[PDB]
Every structure is written in structure tokens, then in C-alpha cells.
Short mmCIF file of C-alpha atoms and ligand atoms in Angstrom, two decimals:
data_model
loop_
_atom_site.label_atom_id
_atom_site.label_comp_id
_atom_site.label_asym_id
_atom_site.label_seq_id
_atom_site.Cartn_x
_atom_site.Cartn_y
_atom_site.Cartn_z
CA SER U 1 -0.08 -0.02 0.05
CA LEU U 2 3.13 2.17 0.09
CA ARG U 3 3.03 2.51 -3.54
CA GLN U 4 -0.73 3.46 -3.25
CA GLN U 5 0.10 6.29 -1.13
CA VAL U 6 2.97 7.60 -3.09
CA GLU U 7 0.65 7.62 -6.06
CA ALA U 8 -2.19 9.40 -3.79
CA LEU U 9 0.21 12.13 -2.38
CA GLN U 10 1.67 12.59 -5.76
CA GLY U 11 -1.87 13.27 -7.22
CA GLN U 12 -2.46 15.76 -4.09
CA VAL U 13 0.97 17.36 -4.60
CA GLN U 14 0.49 17.81 -8.29
CA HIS U 15 -3.00 19.31 -7.76
CA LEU U 16 -1.18 21.51 -5.28
CA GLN U 17 1.22 22.56 -8.14
CA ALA U 18 -1.67 23.42 -10.46
CA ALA U 19 -3.46 25.63 -7.77
CA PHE U 20 0.00 27.20 -6.75
CA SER U 21 0.77 28.03 -10.11
CA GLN U 22 -2.63 29.66 -10.86
CA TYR U 23 -2.38 31.77 -7.59
CA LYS U 24 1.10 32.83 -8.53
CA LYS U 25 0.02 34.14 -12.00
CA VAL U 26 -3.00 36.05 -10.07
CA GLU U 27 -0.33 37.37 -7.59
CA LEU U 28 1.84 39.02 -10.08
CA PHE U 29 -0.98 40.79 -11.85
CA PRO U 30 -0.66 43.68 -12.30
CA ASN U 31 2.25 44.79 -9.92
CA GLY U 32 4.72 41.95 -10.21
CA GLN U 33 7.03 40.47 -12.71
CA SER U 34 8.99 37.21 -12.68
CA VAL U 35 12.01 36.68 -14.86
CA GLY U 36 14.31 33.48 -14.12
CA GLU U 37 13.98 32.82 -10.37
CA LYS U 38 13.55 36.16 -9.41
CA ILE U 39 10.45 38.12 -8.64
CA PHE U 40 10.10 41.95 -8.96
CA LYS U 41 6.90 43.69 -7.33
CA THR U 42 6.28 47.34 -6.82
CA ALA U 43 4.45 48.72 -3.78
CA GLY U 44 2.95 51.19 -5.95
CA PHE U 45 3.93 54.37 -4.25
CA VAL U 46 7.23 56.49 -4.21
CA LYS U 47 9.65 56.73 -1.40
CA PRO U 48 13.07 58.23 -0.74
CA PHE U 49 16.01 55.66 -1.20
CA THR U 50 16.55 55.04 2.71
CA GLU U 51 12.74 54.35 3.28
CA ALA U 52 12.29 52.27 0.02
CA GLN U 53 15.31 49.97 0.98
CA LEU U 54 13.94 49.42 4.55
CA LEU U 55 10.50 48.43 3.02
CA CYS U 56 12.28 45.80 1.08
CA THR U 57 14.48 44.32 3.47
CA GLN U 58 11.87 44.24 6.21
CA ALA U 59 9.83 42.46 3.47
CA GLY U 60 12.58 39.70 3.20
CA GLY U 61 13.97 40.93 0.04
CA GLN U 62 16.01 44.00 -1.52
CA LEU U 63 15.38 46.77 -3.69
CA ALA U 64 15.29 45.94 -7.58
CA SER U 65 18.76 44.73 -8.73
CA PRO U 66 18.75 44.05 -12.35
CA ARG U 67 21.79 41.75 -13.13
CA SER U 68 21.23 41.15 -16.76
CA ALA U 69 19.63 42.46 -19.89
CA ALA U 70 16.66 40.21 -19.20
CA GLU U 71 16.22 41.07 -15.60
CA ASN U 72 16.22 44.92 -16.57
CA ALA U 73 13.71 44.24 -19.25
CA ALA U 74 11.28 42.67 -16.84
CA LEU U 75 11.74 45.48 -14.29
CA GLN U 76 11.24 48.18 -17.20
CA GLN U 77 7.72 46.71 -17.71
CA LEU U 78 6.57 47.37 -14.21
CA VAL U 79 8.16 51.02 -14.45
CA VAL U 80 6.59 51.64 -17.75
CA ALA U 81 3.19 50.33 -16.47
CA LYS U 82 3.30 52.50 -13.51
CA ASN U 83 4.71 55.29 -15.50
CA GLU U 84 7.08 56.08 -12.60
CA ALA U 85 10.94 56.08 -12.35
CA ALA U 86 12.07 53.53 -9.83
CA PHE U 87 15.15 53.08 -7.34
CA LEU U 88 17.63 50.26 -7.82
CA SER U 89 19.50 48.77 -4.85
CA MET U 90 23.05 49.93 -5.90
CA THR U 91 24.78 53.16 -4.42
CA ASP U 92 28.46 54.57 -4.68
CA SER U 93 27.96 56.10 -1.34
CA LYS U 94 31.15 54.28 -0.18
CA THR U 95 33.32 55.12 -2.87
CA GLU U 96 32.21 57.96 -5.27
CA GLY U 97 32.10 56.52 -8.68
CA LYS U 98 32.09 52.99 -7.87
CA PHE U 99 28.53 51.44 -7.74
CA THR U 100 27.74 48.46 -5.80
CA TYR U 101 25.07 46.08 -4.53
CA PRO U 102 23.98 46.12 -0.91
CA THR U 103 26.55 43.33 -0.18
CA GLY U 104 29.48 45.39 -1.41
CA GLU U 105 30.16 43.57 -4.75
CA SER U 106 30.51 45.55 -8.01
CA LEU U 107 28.22 45.66 -10.62
CA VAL U 108 27.93 42.70 -12.94
CA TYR U 109 25.61 44.62 -15.43
CA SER U 110 24.79 48.11 -16.23
CA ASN U 111 22.43 50.09 -18.41
CA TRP U 112 23.42 53.80 -18.05
CA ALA U 113 21.75 56.20 -20.03
CA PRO U 114 24.04 58.31 -22.20
CA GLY U 115 26.27 60.63 -19.98
CA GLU U 116 25.36 58.71 -16.96
CA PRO U 117 26.52 58.42 -14.26
CA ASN U 118 27.45 62.14 -13.73
CA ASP U 119 27.12 62.67 -10.15
CA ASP U 120 25.33 65.82 -10.95
CA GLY U 121 25.22 68.46 -8.38
CA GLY U 122 28.10 66.55 -6.55
CA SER U 123 25.79 64.30 -4.81
CA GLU U 124 23.93 61.92 -6.77
CA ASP U 125 24.66 58.37 -5.07
CA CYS U 126 21.67 56.28 -5.73
CA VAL U 127 20.48 54.98 -9.13
CA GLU U 128 16.96 55.19 -10.97
CA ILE U 129 15.62 53.32 -13.92
CA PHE U 130 13.73 55.25 -16.26
CA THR U 131 10.62 54.10 -18.40
CA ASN U 132 13.07 53.46 -21.10
CA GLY U 133 15.01 51.09 -18.94
CA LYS U 134 17.97 53.24 -18.81
CA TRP U 135 19.59 54.16 -15.66
CA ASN U 136 20.64 57.39 -14.07
CA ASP U 137 22.29 58.05 -10.84
CA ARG U 138 20.00 60.13 -8.68
CA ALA U 139 20.35 61.88 -5.31
CA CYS U 140 19.07 59.45 -2.77
CA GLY U 141 16.89 61.91 -1.08
CA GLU U 142 14.50 62.15 -4.00
CA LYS U 143 11.37 59.98 -4.21
CA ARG U 144 11.19 57.08 -6.54
CA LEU U 145 8.77 54.09 -7.39
CA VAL U 146 9.49 51.50 -4.79
CA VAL U 147 10.25 48.08 -6.35
CA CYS U 148 11.47 44.93 -4.38
CA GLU U 149 12.89 41.71 -5.63
CA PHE U 150 12.31 38.43 -3.86
CA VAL I 1 12.77 -1.11 2.89
CA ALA I 2 11.39 0.99 6.00
CA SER I 3 13.38 3.67 4.87
CA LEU I 4 11.09 4.50 1.85
CA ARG I 5 8.13 4.24 4.28
CA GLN I 6 10.03 6.82 6.69
CA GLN I 7 10.22 9.26 3.75
CA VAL I 8 6.73 8.97 2.75
CA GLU I 9 5.47 9.78 6.16
CA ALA I 10 7.83 12.67 6.00
CA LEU I 11 6.44 13.82 2.60
CA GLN I 12 2.98 13.54 4.24
CA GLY I 13 3.68 15.97 6.83
CA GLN I 14 5.44 18.61 4.43
CA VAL I 15 2.45 18.33 2.09
CA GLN I 16 -0.13 18.58 4.78
CA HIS I 17 2.02 21.98 5.77
CA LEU I 18 1.73 23.50 2.53
CA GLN I 19 -1.86 22.71 1.97
CA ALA I 20 -2.82 24.36 5.42
CA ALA I 21 -0.57 27.42 4.48
CA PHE I 22 -1.47 27.73 0.90
CA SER I 23 -5.18 27.53 2.12
CA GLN I 24 -4.73 30.55 4.15
CA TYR I 25 -2.74 32.57 1.63
CA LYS I 26 -5.47 31.71 -0.92
CA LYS I 27 -7.75 33.85 1.04
CA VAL I 28 -5.27 36.58 1.79
CA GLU I 29 -4.20 36.91 -1.80
CA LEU I 30 -7.72 37.47 -3.12
CA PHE I 31 -8.53 40.41 -0.73
CA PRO I 32 -9.68 42.71 -1.72
CA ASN I 33 -8.93 42.73 -5.69
CA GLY I 34 -9.86 38.92 -6.37
CA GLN I 35 -12.88 36.67 -6.78
CA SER I 36 -12.54 32.86 -6.79
CA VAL I 37 -15.38 30.93 -8.48
CA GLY I 38 -15.43 27.20 -9.42
CA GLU I 39 -11.88 26.72 -10.87
CA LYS I 40 -11.72 30.40 -12.33
CA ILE I 41 -10.27 33.31 -10.63
CA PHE I 42 -11.00 37.03 -11.48
CA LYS I 43 -8.47 39.60 -10.62
CA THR I 44 -8.84 43.59 -11.17
CA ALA I 45 -5.96 45.82 -11.87
CA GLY I 46 -7.72 48.76 -10.22
CA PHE I 47 -7.59 51.11 -13.06
CA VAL I 48 -9.19 51.66 -16.42
CA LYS I 49 -7.77 51.07 -20.22
CA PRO I 50 -9.16 50.88 -23.68
CA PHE I 51 -9.86 47.25 -24.64
CA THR I 52 -6.71 46.52 -26.46
CA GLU I 53 -4.66 47.50 -23.96
CA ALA I 54 -6.87 45.80 -21.19
CA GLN I 55 -6.53 42.63 -23.45
CA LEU I 56 -2.73 43.13 -23.57
CA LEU I 57 -2.23 43.31 -19.88
CA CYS I 58 -4.20 40.22 -19.29
CA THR I 59 -2.37 37.93 -22.00
CA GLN I 60 0.88 39.38 -21.01
CA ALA I 61 0.10 38.16 -17.52
CA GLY I 62 -0.85 34.56 -18.47
CA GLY I 63 -4.55 35.02 -18.32
CA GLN I 64 -7.23 36.90 -20.45
CA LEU I 65 -9.81 39.40 -19.94
CA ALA I 66 -12.62 38.32 -17.85
CA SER I 67 -15.06 35.82 -19.65
CA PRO I 68 -17.94 35.12 -17.51
CA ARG I 69 -19.40 31.70 -18.95
CA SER I 70 -22.35 31.30 -16.16
CA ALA I 71 -24.48 33.21 -13.80
CA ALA I 72 -21.97 32.29 -11.01
CA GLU I 73 -19.08 33.66 -12.64
CA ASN I 74 -20.84 36.77 -13.92
CA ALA I 75 -21.93 37.44 -10.25
CA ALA I 76 -18.27 37.00 -9.13
CA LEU I 77 -17.13 39.39 -11.54
CA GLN I 78 -19.72 41.80 -10.77
CA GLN I 79 -18.52 41.67 -7.06
CA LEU I 80 -15.33 43.34 -8.17
CA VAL I 81 -17.03 45.83 -10.49
CA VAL I 82 -19.42 46.93 -7.55
CA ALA I 83 -16.34 47.06 -5.41
CA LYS I 84 -14.36 49.51 -7.55
CA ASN I 85 -17.70 51.14 -8.70
CA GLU I 86 -16.47 50.89 -12.25
CA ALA I 87 -17.85 48.94 -15.36
CA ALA I 88 -15.41 46.66 -16.81
CA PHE I 89 -14.62 45.04 -20.21
CA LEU I 90 -15.07 41.61 -21.00
CA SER I 91 -13.08 39.59 -23.43
CA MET I 92 -15.83 39.09 -26.02
CA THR I 93 -16.35 41.16 -29.22
CA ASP I 94 -17.92 41.04 -32.63
CA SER I 95 -15.38 42.52 -34.49
CA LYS I 96 -15.01 39.77 -36.84
CA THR I 97 -18.71 39.45 -37.73
CA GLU I 98 -21.08 42.05 -36.72
CA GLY I 99 -23.74 40.97 -34.25
CA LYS I 100 -21.63 37.58 -33.55
CA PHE I 101 -20.08 37.76 -30.14
CA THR I 102 -17.05 35.42 -29.68
CA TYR I 103 -14.62 34.61 -26.89
CA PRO I 104 -10.97 35.27 -27.85
CA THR I 105 -10.78 31.64 -28.97
CA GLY I 106 -13.58 32.44 -31.61
CA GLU I 107 -16.07 30.19 -29.85
CA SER I 108 -19.68 31.70 -29.54
CA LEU I 109 -20.99 32.57 -26.19
CA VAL I 110 -22.31 30.05 -23.86
CA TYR I 111 -23.78 32.63 -21.45
CA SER I 112 -24.93 36.21 -21.87
CA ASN I 113 -26.52 38.82 -19.57
CA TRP I 114 -27.31 41.50 -21.79
CA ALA I 115 -29.37 44.58 -20.68
CA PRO I 116 -32.71 44.99 -22.34
CA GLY I 117 -32.07 46.21 -25.99
CA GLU I 118 -28.49 45.17 -26.02
CA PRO I 119 -26.44 44.62 -27.84
CA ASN I 120 -27.30 47.68 -30.20
CA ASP I 121 -24.21 48.47 -31.85
CA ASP I 122 -24.97 51.95 -30.98
CA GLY I 123 -23.79 54.32 -33.51
CA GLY I 124 -22.68 51.56 -35.75
CA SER I 125 -19.33 51.22 -33.68
CA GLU I 126 -19.61 49.23 -30.62
CA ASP I 127 -17.87 45.60 -30.75
CA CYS I 128 -16.74 45.25 -27.28
CA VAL I 129 -18.71 44.37 -23.96
CA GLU I 130 -18.69 46.13 -20.63
CA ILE I 131 -20.51 44.78 -17.49
CA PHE I 132 -22.20 47.45 -15.23
CA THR I 133 -22.72 47.39 -11.40
CA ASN I 134 -25.96 45.79 -11.63
CA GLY I 135 -24.30 42.77 -13.36
CA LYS I 136 -26.03 43.59 -16.98
CA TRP I 137 -23.94 43.63 -20.06
CA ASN I 138 -23.61 46.32 -22.88
CA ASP I 139 -21.98 46.43 -26.02
CA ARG I 140 -19.65 49.18 -25.98
CA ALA I 141 -17.06 50.96 -28.22
CA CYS I 142 -13.60 49.47 -27.67
CA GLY I 143 -11.68 52.72 -27.61
CA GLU I 144 -13.68 53.53 -24.52
CA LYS I 145 -11.76 53.13 -21.01
CA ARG I 146 -13.10 50.49 -18.54
CA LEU I 147 -11.96 48.57 -15.37
CA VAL I 148 -9.41 46.16 -16.25
CA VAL I 149 -10.33 42.62 -14.95
CA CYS I 150 -8.54 39.39 -15.94
CA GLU I 151 -9.30 35.77 -15.29
CA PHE I 152 -6.77 33.19 -14.48
CA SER X 1 11.14 1.21 -8.54
CA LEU X 2 9.10 2.61 -5.86
CA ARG X 3 12.36 4.46 -4.60
CA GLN X 4 12.73 6.39 -7.94
CA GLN X 5 8.71 7.13 -7.62
CA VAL X 6 9.35 8.76 -3.94
CA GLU X 7 12.61 10.40 -5.30
CA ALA X 8 10.49 12.21 -7.97
CA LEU X 9 7.92 13.17 -5.47
CA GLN X 10 10.71 14.44 -2.92
CA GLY X 11 11.80 16.79 -5.57
CA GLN X 12 8.49 18.14 -6.39
CA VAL X 13 7.59 18.88 -2.63
CA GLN X 14 11.05 20.63 -1.92
CA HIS X 15 10.66 22.86 -4.96
CA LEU X 16 7.32 23.68 -3.77
CA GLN X 17 8.33 24.57 -0.46
CA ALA X 18 10.93 27.07 -1.86
CA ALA X 19 8.59 28.54 -4.40
CA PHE X 20 5.71 28.97 -1.86
CA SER X 21 8.12 30.41 0.64
CA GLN X 22 9.39 33.21 -1.77
CA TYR X 23 5.70 33.66 -2.90
CA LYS X 24 4.62 34.61 0.66
CA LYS X 25 6.96 37.28 0.81
CA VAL X 26 5.76 38.73 -2.29
CA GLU X 27 2.09 38.46 -1.27
CA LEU X 28 2.68 40.27 2.05
CA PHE X 29 4.50 42.88 0.37
CA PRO X 30 3.54 45.77 1.02
CA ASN X 31 0.04 45.52 2.47
CA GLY X 32 0.50 42.13 4.83
CA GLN X 33 1.62 41.34 8.06
CA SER X 34 2.33 37.78 9.34
CA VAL X 35 2.48 37.39 13.40
CA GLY X 36 2.49 33.62 14.52
CA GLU X 37 -0.16 31.82 12.42
CA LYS X 38 -2.11 35.08 11.70
CA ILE X 39 -2.13 37.16 8.70
CA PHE X 40 -3.31 40.87 8.94
CA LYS X 41 -3.59 42.42 5.35
CA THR X 42 -4.92 46.08 4.49
CA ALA X 43 -7.37 46.83 1.44
CA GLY X 44 -5.66 50.34 1.43
CA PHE X 45 -8.75 52.28 1.60
CA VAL X 46 -11.39 53.47 4.35
CA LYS X 47 -14.86 52.22 4.89
CA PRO X 48 -17.52 52.68 7.73
CA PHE X 49 -17.41 49.61 10.22
CA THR X 50 -20.38 47.62 8.79
CA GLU X 51 -19.04 47.71 5.18
CA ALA X 52 -15.36 47.17 6.61
CA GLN X 53 -16.96 44.06 8.43
CA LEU X 54 -18.78 42.59 5.51
CA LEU X 55 -15.42 42.91 3.28
CA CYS X 56 -13.61 40.92 5.60
CA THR X 57 -16.21 38.30 6.26
CA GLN X 58 -16.89 37.74 2.60
CA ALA X 59 -13.20 37.23 2.20
CA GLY X 60 -13.19 34.50 4.41
CA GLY X 61 -11.67 36.45 7.47
CA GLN X 62 -12.83 38.98 9.80
CA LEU X 63 -11.70 42.69 10.75
CA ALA X 64 -8.33 42.92 12.58
CA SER X 65 -8.64 41.20 16.06
CA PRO X 66 -5.23 41.66 17.97
CA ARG X 67 -5.19 39.46 20.96
CA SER X 68 -1.64 40.11 22.09
CA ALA X 69 1.22 42.72 22.25
CA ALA X 70 2.85 40.94 19.48
CA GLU X 71 -0.22 41.15 17.12
CA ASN X 72 -1.11 44.52 17.82
CA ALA X 73 2.59 45.73 16.96
CA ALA X 74 2.21 43.89 13.76
CA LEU X 75 -1.13 45.52 12.97
CA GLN X 76 0.22 48.79 14.05
CA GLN X 77 2.91 48.42 11.39
CA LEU X 78 0.39 48.47 8.55
CA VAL X 79 -1.71 51.43 10.19
CA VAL X 80 1.60 53.37 10.29
CA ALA X 81 2.69 52.68 6.79
CA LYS X 82 -0.71 53.80 5.37
CA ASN X 83 -0.83 56.46 7.99
CA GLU X 84 -4.66 55.62 8.53
CA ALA X 85 -6.15 54.54 11.57
CA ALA X 86 -8.13 51.36 11.05
CA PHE X 87 -11.03 49.62 12.54
CA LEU X 88 -10.62 46.44 15.09
CA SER X 89 -13.39 43.70 14.97
CA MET X 90 -14.62 44.47 18.43
CA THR X 91 -17.60 46.25 19.62
CA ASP X 92 -19.80 46.83 22.92
CA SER X 93 -22.95 47.28 20.44
CA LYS X 94 -24.72 44.45 22.60
CA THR X 95 -23.83 45.55 26.09
CA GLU X 96 -22.51 49.25 26.32
CA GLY X 97 -19.36 49.18 28.25
CA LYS X 98 -18.61 45.59 27.20
CA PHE X 99 -16.33 45.22 24.27
CA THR X 100 -16.27 41.69 22.52
CA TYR X 101 -14.99 39.67 19.54
CA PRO X 102 -17.43 38.76 16.69
CA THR X 103 -17.88 35.49 18.64
CA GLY X 104 -19.23 37.26 21.86
CA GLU X 105 -16.35 36.52 24.06
CA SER X 106 -14.83 39.26 26.11
CA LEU X 107 -11.42 40.76 25.28
CA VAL X 108 -8.30 38.65 26.02
CA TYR X 109 -5.84 41.58 25.45
CA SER X 110 -6.49 45.49 25.34
CA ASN X 111 -4.36 48.52 24.51
CA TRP X 112 -6.65 51.22 25.14
CA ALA X 113 -5.23 54.74 24.73
CA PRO X 114 -5.51 57.07 28.20
CA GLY X 115 -9.18 57.64 29.29
CA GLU X 116 -10.54 55.27 26.48
CA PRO X 117 -12.96 53.56 25.95
CA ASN X 118 -15.51 56.61 26.67
CA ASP X 119 -18.40 56.30 24.56
CA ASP X 120 -18.22 59.79 23.48
CA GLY X 121 -21.40 61.64 22.74
CA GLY X 122 -22.86 58.47 24.02
CA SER X 123 -22.44 56.85 20.67
CA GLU X 124 -18.96 54.93 20.12
CA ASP X 125 -19.48 51.31 19.83
CA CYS X 126 -16.52 50.48 17.40
CA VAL X 127 -12.64 50.46 18.08
CA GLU X 128 -9.87 52.12 16.07
CA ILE X 129 -6.35 51.54 16.35
CA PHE X 130 -3.97 54.71 16.02
CA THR X 131 -0.43 54.75 14.35
CA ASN X 132 0.73 54.63 18.12
CA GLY X 133 -0.80 51.31 18.39
CA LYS X 134 -3.48 52.72 21.24
CA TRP X 135 -7.06 51.93 20.90
CA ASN X 136 -9.88 54.32 21.08
CA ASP X 137 -13.69 53.61 20.92
CA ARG X 138 -15.26 55.51 17.85
CA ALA X 139 -18.54 55.83 16.10
CA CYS X 140 -19.11 53.05 13.88
CA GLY X 141 -20.24 55.16 11.06
CA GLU X 142 -16.98 56.79 10.83
CA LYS X 143 -14.57 55.59 7.83
CA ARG X 144 -11.40 53.96 8.90
CA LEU X 145 -8.70 51.77 7.13
CA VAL X 146 -10.07 48.23 6.42
CA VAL X 147 -7.63 45.63 7.72
CA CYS X 148 -8.74 41.96 7.80
CA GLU X 149 -7.06 39.04 9.61
CA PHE X 150 -6.61 35.42 8.02
O1 GMH K 201 20.41 63.47 -12.42
C1 GMH K 201 20.49 64.30 -13.32
C2 GMH K 201 20.42 63.87 -14.72
O2 GMH K 201 21.68 63.09 -14.85
C3 GMH K 201 20.71 65.03 -15.86
O3 GMH K 201 22.02 65.79 -15.51
C4 GMH K 201 22.43 67.05 -16.11
O4 GMH K 201 21.60 67.85 -16.17
C5 GMH K 201 22.40 66.51 -17.47
O5 GMH K 201 23.50 65.90 -17.94
C6 GMH K 201 20.97 65.85 -18.26
O6 GMH K 201 21.16 65.33 -19.57
C7 GMH K 201 21.06 64.79 -17.20
O7 GMH K 201 19.63 63.96 -17.57
O1 GMH K 202 -23.90 51.75 -25.26
C1 GMH K 202 -24.71 52.59 -25.59
C2 GMH K 202 -26.15 52.05 -25.12
O2 GMH K 202 -26.69 50.89 -25.58
C3 GMH K 202 -27.35 53.22 -25.21
O3 GMH K 202 -27.46 53.44 -26.51
C4 GMH K 202 -28.48 54.59 -26.96
O4 GMH K 202 -27.93 55.82 -26.55
C5 GMH K 202 -29.84 54.45 -26.58
O5 GMH K 202 -30.14 53.08 -27.06
C6 GMH K 202 -29.64 54.00 -24.72
O6 GMH K 202 -30.99 53.44 -24.07
C7 GMH K 202 -28.56 52.90 -24.53
O7 GMH K 202 -28.35 52.45 -23.24
O1 GMH K 203 -13.48 59.19 20.31
C1 GMH K 203 -13.21 60.55 20.69
C2 GMH K 203 -12.21 60.70 21.78
O2 GMH K 203 -12.20 59.95 22.65
C3 GMH K 203 -12.16 62.12 22.38
O3 GMH K 203 -13.58 62.21 22.98
C4 GMH K 203 -13.62 63.55 23.63
O4 GMH K 203 -13.75 64.46 22.67
C5 GMH K 203 -12.59 63.61 24.66
O5 GMH K 203 -12.73 62.89 25.78
C6 GMH K 203 -11.29 63.76 23.92
O6 GMH K 203 -10.00 63.87 24.97
C7 GMH K 203 -11.25 62.22 23.26
O7 GMH K 203 -9.80 62.20 22.64
CA1 CA K 204 28.83 60.88 -3.46
CA1 CA K 205 27.72 59.49 -6.82
CA1 CA K 206 22.68 61.67 -13.10
CA1 CA K 207 -18.79 46.27 -35.90
CA1 CA K 208 -21.13 45.54 -32.86
CA1 CA K 209 -24.55 49.31 -26.58
CA1 CA K 210 -23.72 51.68 22.74
CA1 CA K 211 -20.02 52.10 23.51
CA1 CA K 212 -13.51 57.38 22.44
#
């Protein structure tokens, strides 16, 4: 009967997989985007960098950190849909000119708009992504769309 | 051997936890922008868009525009429309053949809840369908903006 | 061969646990809070008590019912985030001066602001929670943030 149980439990698990897959699609509409094993989700409102960063970390994730063209495109979809530029997780607060992820690791991908980053004004240590997907270093005190990744 | 037995017993415990946890999250997830009816789930985006844009949003999300195929589904959909107090677009149109409304697949309707006198192709240019807060349907110009509600 | 059958099932279950865990974080961000086996979720808008109560009940849950300091703090987080006081499920509509849960039992926990409840104007049978986490009885006809528990 052990084989029978495995047969039965697998039926329940595959039914669970089906239900879960459906609820996942529902979950991401319309404020989320999945790319690979990563999920981006916007809070739907704007906040300064520090507050946005805290919201994501307290939620068990971190600010959007596109590490490839594919991830950047998925994130771009949310920014376009909300029509609001969003903050990324990277900053060059430690070493001006050198942007890093929250862990301190150097960028493995970038999509800077022409002429960026320019540390305009002498104090732009955060990064925002435009509706066109391009990046721009921006003053961390400005308010931008909050998008976290999980 | 008994090793497999122990593993099956372990799997049963993990599965029961997932089922209970998932049962709770289903309710949490659908509050307040979703409605479950049978094996279908309606989810509103909370904003309005013209038909073509609304349709694209749903298809890109892995679903399609709300397609109520029974009174029960139509009532579930109506709940979201009433909550947002915004009439919504359905997926059906008679863009191909005037007077013949079909689902995106091309199949003819299996259920309808037209308000009296509808569809009337008003102005000779209404190929889309909207559902009112009272649950009744009305054919409407696809260029108009209505609440976006997808089904999954 | 049963071993290879169980082995396949184990793979599915382990993947589901990981996928479900990631999804839980996505769902709770930014309108939910999990504390113990309870989950609070705000609709993000305000409604009078009766309408708020119906929304929660029809959703398969009930209005926020903090039963401990831990739960109250979790609920408070949502109130603070939305900067809108929220209705709790308890009322003393049946017997003035005696607040009870929807079931009818008396409170097992409370966090009343100084001087409350005071049945102001002789007509406050509902309860709101402030951004400071304290409670105040309020007219059920007033509109407050809708927060349900599941
Ligand atoms: O964050 C500020 C922006 O980088 C802005 O800076 C300068 O004013 C110019 O280089 C603009 O073209 C650029 O868009
Ligand atoms: O979509 C437009 C509606 O059909 C509208 O059209 C006309 O104006 C009349 O027939 C109305 O009674 C009807 O409600
Ligand atoms: O809900 C109404 C509040 O209790 C309010 O009532 C009265 O106006 C006074 O007792 C205030 O100090 C108190 O804050
Ligand atoms: Ca600097
Ligand atoms: Ca800088
Ligand atoms: Ca710049
Ligand atoms: Ca036509
Ligand atoms: Ca028509
Ligand atoms: Ca019409
Ligand atoms: Ca009273
Ligand atoms: Ca009272
Ligand atoms: Ca009071």
C-alpha cells in the first residue's frame, strides 16, 4: 500500500502545484514581474531611497537589482506600467564613482543612459531606472517608485 | 525497505503543512481585488484602460480578459465591478462578424446577461462588451476606457 | 522502482516549499503582516465599520482582532505604513461598556489609549487603532482603514 500512498500523495502534490501556479499568476498581476527565479514587485508608491530600502529588507527581499538585460527588461515593464521611474538597490556612497549592490559587490551589469552616471550636483549616489529602461544616478533623497525583488 | 516508508511519512507531513499554509494565503491574496469562483479566478488591476490595452495586460500576465461563462461567474465578476464602482470590459467582441459575439478563441457565447435592448451596436461602432455594477452587459466602443479585470 | 517514484515526489515537494516561501514574501509586500499563525492585510482604503466588516467576512476572514502585544504591533505596522487609523473587529454594541469579539467572548487583550473607551457623545461602539498602536472607541459610522485578518 506504500506505492498506493505515493500515488495518492503525488496526485495531491500535482493538484497543489496546479493551484499554486494559478495563484502565482494572479499574485503578479498587475504589480509584479517574474524573470528566471527572481520576482519584482512594486509597492505602487514612491519613497526616498532609505525608506524604500528598508521596506524591501523588512519584507525579506531587497531593492530591485537587475543583473542582466533580461532582468532589466522585466523591471522596465513595471516602471512603464506604473509610469514612474524607480530606485535600484545600488549606490556609490562608499566610494564615489563605484556603484555596488547592498553586499558590496561591484556591478555585473549596467544600463546607464548616455552621459550617466555624472554625479550631477556633486551628490547623486543612488540609481533610478527610467521608463525606457536606462539608468541614471540620482540623489538618494528624491522620491522614486518602490520596487523590491524576491 | 522501511527507509522508503519513513520518507513517505515525512512527505505527508510536509504536504499537509503546504496545503494548510496555502489555504490561508489563497484568501489573503484574493482580498480585496480578486474573486474565486469554481476553478476560475478574476483579478482586477484597479484601473481603467481601452480594450486593446486591457487585453494585452491580461494576456501578458498569462490570463485573459474576464470571460464569464455562467451566472455564477458573472456574479463573481460583478462583485469586483461593484467594489471598484467601475464598469469593466469583458473579453468578447463581434469585431470579426457584426452581431456575432465570440470569446478570444472564436467560440460563440455560452452565456450572456445583456441589458434589455443590447447589444445595439450604437452609432454602428460598438464591438466590445462592458458589465455594469448591476451585472448586466452592454456592447460598448472598444476605444472607451473601462475597469481592467483578468481571469486566470 | 518505488524508490525512484518517491525520489521524484521529494523533488517536487522541496521545490514547492521554496517556491511557496518566496511567494509568501511577495504577497505580504506591502500590505500584509504575518505574526504567528495570523496574517493581517489591509485593503488600502477606508470604509465605515459595517462595510469593512462585510468585506472581511466575505473574503473568508474577519476584521483585525489583535489578541496580544505581538499581534497589535504587527497590525500597528500597517496602520503606520498607510498613516490611517484602522477599525478593529470588537464592539460593545450588544452591551454598552462591554467590548467583545465577533464571537461574543470578552477581550483577552486590550491596548486602550488613556481615558478610553469613553463612549463619546454616548455613541461610540466600535474601536480604532492609532498609528501609536493605542485603541480608541469610535462611532461605527466613521470611515477607517480596512484591515482584515486571516
Ligand atoms: O540626475 C540628473 C541627470 O543626470 C541630468 O543631469 C544634467 O543635468 C544633464 O546631464 C542631463 O542630460 C541629465 O539627464
Ligand atoms: O452603449 C450605448 C447604450 O446602448 C445606449 O445607446 C443609446 O444611446 C440608447 O439605445 C440607450 O438607451 C442605450 O443605453
Ligand atoms: O473618540 C473620541 C475621543 O475619545 C475624544 O473624546 C472627547 O472628545 C474627549 O474625551 C477627547 O479627549 C477624546 O480624545
Ligand atoms: Ca557621493
Ligand atoms: Ca555618486
Ligand atoms: Ca545623473
Ligand atoms: Ca462592428
Ligand atoms: Ca458590434
Ligand atoms: Ca450598446
Ligand atoms: Ca452603545
Ligand atoms: Ca460604547
Ligand atoms: Ca472614544
